[PDB]
Motif scaffolding. Sequence first.
Motif, PDB file in Angstrom:
ATOM      1  N   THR A  42       1.130  -1.315  -0.276  1.00 57.37           N
ATOM      2  CA  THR A  42      -0.053  -0.029   0.092  1.00 57.37           C
ATOM      3  C   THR A  42       0.593   1.500  -0.053  1.00 57.37           C
ATOM      4  OG1 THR A  42       0.055  -0.785   1.955  1.00 57.37           O
ATOM      5  CG2 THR A  42      -1.679  -0.463   1.169  1.00 57.37           C
ATOM      6  N   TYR A  43       0.512   2.418  -0.017  1.00 57.81           N
ATOM      7  CA  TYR A  43       0.600   3.841  -0.742  1.00 57.81           C
ATOM      8  C   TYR A  43       0.007   4.591   0.460  1.00 57.81           C
ATOM      9  CZ  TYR A  43       4.020   2.136  -4.650  1.00 57.81           C
ATOM     10  OH  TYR A  43       4.818   1.878  -5.425  1.00 57.81           O
ATOM     11  N   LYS A  44       0.479   5.750   0.134  1.00 55.82           N
ATOM     12  CA  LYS A  44      -0.735   6.763   0.993  1.00 55.82           C
ATOM     13  C   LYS A  44      -0.931   7.674   0.326  1.00 55.82           C
ATOM     14  CE  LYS A  44       0.044   8.016   5.863  1.00 55.82           C
ATOM     15  NZ  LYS A  44       0.832   7.386   7.357  1.00 55.82           N
ATOM     16  N   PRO A  92       0.326   5.111  -6.526  1.00 54.54           N
ATOM     17  CA  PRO A  92      -0.530   4.356  -6.470  1.00 54.54           C
ATOM     18  C   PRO A  92       0.003   4.048  -7.864  1.00 54.54           C
ATOM     19  CG  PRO A  92      -2.298   4.899  -5.406  1.00 54.54           C
ATOM     20  CD  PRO A  92      -0.618   5.848  -4.778  1.00 54.54           C
TER      21      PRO A  92
END
Lengths: 102, 51, 44
Positions: A42-44, A92
Motif C-alpha cells: 500500500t501507498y499513502k 499508486p
Amino acid sequence: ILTMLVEPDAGKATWVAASTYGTDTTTGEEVKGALKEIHFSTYKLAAKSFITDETEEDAIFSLLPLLRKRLIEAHAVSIEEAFMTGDGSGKPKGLLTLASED
Amino acid sequence: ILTMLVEPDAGKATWVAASTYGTDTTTGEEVKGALKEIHFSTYKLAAKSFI
Amino acid sequence: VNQSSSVEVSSESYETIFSQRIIRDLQKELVVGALFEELPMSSK
C-alpha cells in the motif's frame, strides 16, 4: 504485503510411441509446475488543512465544515487523479500508465 | 445586491512515500481553498401610458 | 481576508457584522430658535 499464489501455466503431456509401450517411458514425460506469487502493498495519500483560531472568529460563518469536506474530498480526488495517470513512484500506478507499461 | 458564497474548486492530496513515514511530510501538503461570491442585481424596466 | 486558515472567507464582507445602529456626533446646540416668544399672527 499480501501474497497470493497464482497457479502455474499448463504444460503438455507427451505422446508416447508404440515402442515405449511396455517400458518405463510408457508413463510419459513428467508435467511439472511451480506456483508463482503476486504481491500487494500500500501507498499513502494524505492531506492537511488548518483552521487558525482566528479565522474561525473572523467569519460570520463557521468554516470548519468546509475544511473537513474539502478535506475528505481532497482525498477522493487524489486517489482519482492518480489512479488514472499515476506514475507509480510513490503513488499508486494507474490504469493509463499500467497500460503503457504493458 | 445579493451575494452568495460559491464553494471553491477541488483540491488534491499528496501521495506520500515510504520514506516520509515518520516525518512531517507524512501528512501531506495543505489542501487550501477559498469561498468566492456571486453577486446578484436587478435592472429596472418601465412603461408609461396616458389616457 | 484572513487568508491564513486553509479555508478562508470569500470577501471581507462576510467577516463583518454590518450593524445598523446609527450614531451621530454631539451636535450643535440650538439656542435662539426658541428663546423668543411667538406672535400667532392669523393674517398676513
